[PDB]
Amino acid sequence: KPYNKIVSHLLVAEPEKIYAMPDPTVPDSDIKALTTLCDLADRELVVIIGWAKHIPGFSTLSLADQMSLLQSAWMEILILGVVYRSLSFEDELVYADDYIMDEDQSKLAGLLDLNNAILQLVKKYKSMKLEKEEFVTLKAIALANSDSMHIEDVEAVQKLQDVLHEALQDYEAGQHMEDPRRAGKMLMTLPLLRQTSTKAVQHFYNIKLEGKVPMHKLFLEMLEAK
Amino acid sequence: KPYNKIVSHLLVAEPEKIYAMPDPTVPDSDIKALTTLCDLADRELVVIIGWAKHIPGFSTLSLADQMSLLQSAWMEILILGVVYRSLSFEDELVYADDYIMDEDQSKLAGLLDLNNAILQLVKKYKSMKLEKEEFVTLKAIALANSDSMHIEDVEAVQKLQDVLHEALQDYEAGQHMEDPRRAGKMLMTLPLLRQTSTKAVQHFYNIKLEGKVPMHKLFLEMLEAK
Ligand SMILES: Oc1ccc(C2(c3ccc(O)cc3)CCCCC2)cc1
Ligand SMILES: Oc1ccc(C2(c3ccc(O)cc3)CCCCC2)cc1
Secondary structure (H helix, E strand, C coil), X not given: CCCCHHHHHHHHCCCCCCCCCCCCCCCCCHHHHHHHHHHHHHHHHHHHHHHCXCCCCHHHCCHHHHHHHHHHHHHHHHHHHHHHHCCCCCCCEEEECCEEECHHHHHHCCCHHHHXXXXXXXXXXXXXXXXXXXXXXXXXXXXXXXXXXXXXXHHHHHHHHHHHHHHHHHHHHHHCCCCCCHHHHHHCCHHHHHHHXXXXXXXXXXXXXXXXXXXXXXXHHHHHXX | CXXXXXXXXXXXXXXXXXXXXXXXXXXXXXXHHHHXXXXXXXXXXXXXXXXXXXXXXXXXXXXXXXXXXXXXHHHHHHHHHHHHHCCCCCCCEEEECCEEECHHHHHHCCCHHHHHHHHHHHHHXXXXXXXXXXXXXXXXXXXXCCCCCCCCCHHHHHHHHHHHHHHHHXXXXXXXXXXXXXXXXHHCCXXXXXXXXXXXXXXXXXXXXXXXXXXCHHHHHHHHCC
């Protein structure tokens, strides 16, 4: 009756934060900002692949299904990270401790509209007082619930969805008795995450095609997987 | 302890079906198919505005907030309708009783990819054995949970979300004791609905800009509202 083991487990499995390391020799530009961001994403993708797979049941899926889930969910997982890191800030996005974007910098990078949607996600979670326990559980649910069209073992993926959903249910029933509908409210934040991810993928795909911003192999593989 | 009044109420508030009435004098073409579809959407938008509103609390919102919710959610509500009408079919979308699209017709209309996503929604709901009670409750939740950036009374909209969520919870606790997580599973279908809506809006906005397909005023107002 002290809280849910899956939640406890996801908390200890949480990766250490990564630095963006913008090149201090390079003049600030939209190209610099986008290059720095895509480089950070590439490195975070490695972390995410390693992180997944720790999710109970995930490593028992075929490598194909593991890949399918990751290829569908990666943008949502990246976005939920920057949202969480940004909860204590106002109108700023904490991509990394050394890379915090305000409205002006978003404009300069051509990301004002996209970043404003991310800020909408932040605003909603601030109102809800999203906890770390809830954040890690939602990242794992976003992975399991990512709607890949290419899944081999649909029943096994549904089972993963269920284990993680039950964990959220249990956590909320124990920790948040004042709100018998909090788990559901948390699940109801997922559509805006999906919407913002969908738009972010299209945006960076367009940037990929325009050919002006260098991108690493893994990030390109993940982008091209949609 | 017989089922939830909000669910009962949404069932009786369900609009009658509408016909597409493709013009039988016009040769089949992508233009004919898209014109017929946008015309059907325009007429369904009127129905949806009338339907909303019957949702408890909805008419008590400012006209601004009523409009904001409708302008954000309309595509999701239209899509959930064609999904529901299509549950008893295989690889076909029942836009209307007189307008059922198979894979070949989708290709001809340039909607193969979009319609395939809608078919993914259908497939998931078929597996879950979505009921009419659950369909109408999800349409109302999609309206309340539509993430407009323009809401005046955020607390009032959150209250609407909560009333409808509680209705789903209650319905599932009474009707589906075999699955204590069914309400949550239903909420977890909303991200794919949002994703498919997001893509459909962009697609028809592109068609709007290309200027080849005639569109009526209300449909244009709703499209331009995103
Ligand atoms: O932790 C993150 C989150 C998002 C990101 C990206 C991002 C996504 C959306 C956005 O509005 C800004 C940056 C960088 C650019 C490539 C896609 C992912 C990078 C690291
Ligand atoms: O009941 C509906 C549902 C969707 C539709 C549209 C639709 C949406 C998505 C899609 O893949 C096909 C048609 C018609 C074209 C204008 C947008 C809405 C019309 C009536």
